[PDB]
Amino acid sequence: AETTSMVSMPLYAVMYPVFNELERVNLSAAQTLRAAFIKAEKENPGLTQDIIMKILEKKSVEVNFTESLLRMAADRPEPEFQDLNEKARALKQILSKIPDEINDRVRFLQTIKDIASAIKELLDTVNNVFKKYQYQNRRALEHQKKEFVKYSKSFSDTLKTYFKDGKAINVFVSANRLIHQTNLILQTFK
Amino acid sequence: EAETTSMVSMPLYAVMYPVFNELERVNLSAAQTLRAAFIKAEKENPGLTQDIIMKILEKKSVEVNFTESLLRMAADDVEEYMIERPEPEFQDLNEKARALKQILSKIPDEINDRVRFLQTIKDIASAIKELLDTVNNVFKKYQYQNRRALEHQKKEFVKYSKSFSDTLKTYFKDGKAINVFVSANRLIHQTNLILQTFKTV
């Protein structure tokens, strides 16, 4: 009952898990992708292995792309809203500089401190307008705030694991998520 | 649905398309089916290709270990590629190819011993020269249905051989064994292609 070559293993150990998770987002896409990999693998055993390896060999292209997205992610006259916009903007700007700061230990350590205080200022400002929304569906505020502080902690964790791992791409990805969460706070004020 | 002209679709053209370009040489329908599958999925969900690539990158350790295991297995994957011609030179060609693949297969076991690894590299070099010499002799002595295909495959082998040498140089710099494992597997595959071409030619 075992005629499948060992070279085909990555199809089931790598691709199938990815397809299975994709079925919950786009069933049609997952099936099409899976069907295409199955077809190609069955007709030429070893193809999935080489495809996966080539993708790994192009990680640098992926690092560059993840860096550029981070750099790009930085792009009501009420006084409280002007403050919220300013604080959010400063945080996003600092986070977007990470790719060009991470290669220097010293300057990267200061950047982390800049990120800490920037988030602190943002949270303070968030608490300010927080005290003026007088419960008008404020639940969405306490919710979004916590989603932000959750990604903030998740980012802090990513930094710690980075100082032992050395995997910058995880920092870039996490910083990107933090920015998106920063925007979510601003947007929630609908 | 949408067009893949957005920033988030970049990896589709920067990563996947170059990869798919090679498969046309192996299986056109497969390169086309895969290309159509990714572009289709990307149009429906822009950013999907990027997520797929990121998930594959997360399986690096799994892929790395499997690649080493595959290299170790190469020593017992022989009979499928053997040349089925009576002449003595073809039997000698089968032997030279087998011997090369055997030494390449021992790399994972040897790479953790500088002294042993240095010798193994010398043995690989000699095994390659002997393999090429046997190929050249058989090229000159016999007729074939597709001599051009054979010569092309030999030159492909030479490229992957030099690529292997370059990988060794780099390994002595950064000490990443996986690159050596990958390069050895590809050299092994090229060795098998030579054999398979003699079988149909």
Ligand SMILES: O=P(O)(O)O[C@H]1[C@H](O)[C@@H](OP(=O)(O)O)[C@H](OP(=O)(O)O)[C@@H](OP(=O)(O)O)[C@H]1O
């Ligand atoms: O040492 P391990 O645990 O395998 O992890 C590293 C990281 O994945 C590097 O990327 P990152 O800095 O983003 O963590 C990667 O380089 P690139 O991603 O720059 O290509 C290294 O491979 P090499 O590229 O072969 O050095 C790889 O060895």
